[PDB]
Amino acid sequence: SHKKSGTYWATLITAFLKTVSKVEELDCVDSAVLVDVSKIITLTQEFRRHYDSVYRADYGPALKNWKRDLSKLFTSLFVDVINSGRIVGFFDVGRYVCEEVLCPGSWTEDHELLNDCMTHFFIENNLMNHFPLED
């Protein structure tokens, strides 16, 4: 396992969002990408179980306004430190938005906006730096 490119990560982020939005058949994804996607969804599920074991409210009263605030959330989340656990939290926030805020089972224009924002943040912040992947 090692660092991957921004190019690869842009692909991986979109496949991650389409998968959790249920707008890409497992079939239709490149195998290796489907591996990395599943790896990130599994980390997010683990991260969500710890959140849920400590806190009763879900993310849905802060993230209903992801529209103007998402980039603010993302920046606080990395202010004090960058590590892979903060990255997994970043992805679970994006998974929450797809799965409960945005219109379900669809690749709407807001999904594309979520994509851009996450992709623009992951890259501009060099998150690839703190999260290696298989092979």
């Binding site: 991260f47 802060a62 993230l63 603010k72 959330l73 606080s76 989340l77 590590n83 656990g85 939290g89």
Partner: peptide, 20 residues
């Protein structure tokens, strides 16, 4: 609300990353 979310996510990151 949002700053509060942030705080809770960092707590969660600390538990997830408890020691690694």
């Amino acid at each position: 609300t949002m700053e509060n979310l942030s705080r809770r996510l960092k707590v969660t990151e600390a538990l997830f990353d408890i020691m690694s």
